[PDB]
């Protein structure tokens, strides 16, 4: 399983962000709004293949979460689909980026602004978000935003769609890596 692949909780479906590790312990990052209130994660809709259990969740304010792998045989590729990821970096205005999600697949665009505040309503406000002109649709949450072999962010939300075009906001991945003391590989 790799970045962009579907992940299922008891509530719905999101996408795997990046596979990361700390020493010999493997985890995967995804959106905080997906890990919020979720305990177990599965690789399929039938919920027969277990992935792991939620170890951390930060949403709102931020939008990241981490899941500890409990499945010992499933491959944990340090890639996004076939794309190898070798490091993490900070987004910059004008940067060319790419997103992969379980619903819409792979779509590209550019970073249009930094430190954006997104109000999802009901007190669910997230800060310090990366704004882009990349589209995203339900199911894409938590999927990776990358630039070549560099990990950049995690899909949070936005408006519009892939047909008419849209605006998507991403949580900077560097902040998540730092909070959990994990690294991409």
């Amino acid at each position: 399983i790799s970045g962009g692949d579907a992940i299922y909780s008891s509530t719905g479906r999101c996408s795997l962000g990046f596979n990361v590790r700390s020493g010999s312990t493997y985890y995967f990052l995804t959106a905080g709004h997906c890990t919020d209130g979720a305990t177990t994660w599965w690789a399929n809709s039938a919920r027969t293949t277990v992935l792991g259990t939620t170890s951390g969740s930060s949403f709102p304010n931020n939008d990241y979460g981490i899941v500890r792998y409990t499945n010992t045989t499933i491959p944990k590729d340090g890639t996004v689909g076939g794309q190898d990821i070798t490091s993490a970096a900070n987004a910059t205005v004008g940067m060319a980026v790419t997103r992969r999600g379980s619903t819409t697949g792979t779509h590209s665009g550019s970073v249009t602004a930094l430190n954006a505040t997104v109000n999802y309503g009901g007190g669910d406000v997230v800060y310090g978000m990366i704004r882009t002109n990349v589209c995203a649709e339900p199911g894409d949450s938590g999927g990776p935003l990358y630039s070549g072999t560099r990990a950049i962010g995690l899909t949070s939300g936005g408006s519009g769609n892939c047909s008419s075009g849209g605006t998507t906001f991403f949580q900077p991945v560097t902040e998540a890596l730092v909070a959990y003391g994990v690294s991409v590989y």
């Binding site: 509530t11 719905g12 479906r13 999101c14 959106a31 709004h33 997906c34 999600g101 379980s102 619903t103 997104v118 109000n119 999802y120 309503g121 009901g122 995203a136 649709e137 339900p138 199911g139 894409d140 949450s141 899909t155 949070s156 939300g157 936005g158 408006s159 998507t168 906001f169």
Partner: protein
């Protein structure tokens, strides 16, 4: 599902489908409610889950 608190400028993109009266599966409640507002209250909920 109540859409009185809409519309909203943005939605998270998790998948928990709803079926609208237009026979379109809406990805989540936020997407559905924004569509209801965009239709000026003409779109309604048919049932939960995919159409």
């Amino acid at each position: 599902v109540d859409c009185s608190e809409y519309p909203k400028p943005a939605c998270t993109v998790e998948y928990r489908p709803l079926c609208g009266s237009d026979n379109k599966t809406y990805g989540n409640k936020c997407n559905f409610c924004n569509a209801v507002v965009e239709s000026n209250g003409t779109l309604t909920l048919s049932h939960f889950g995919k159409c």
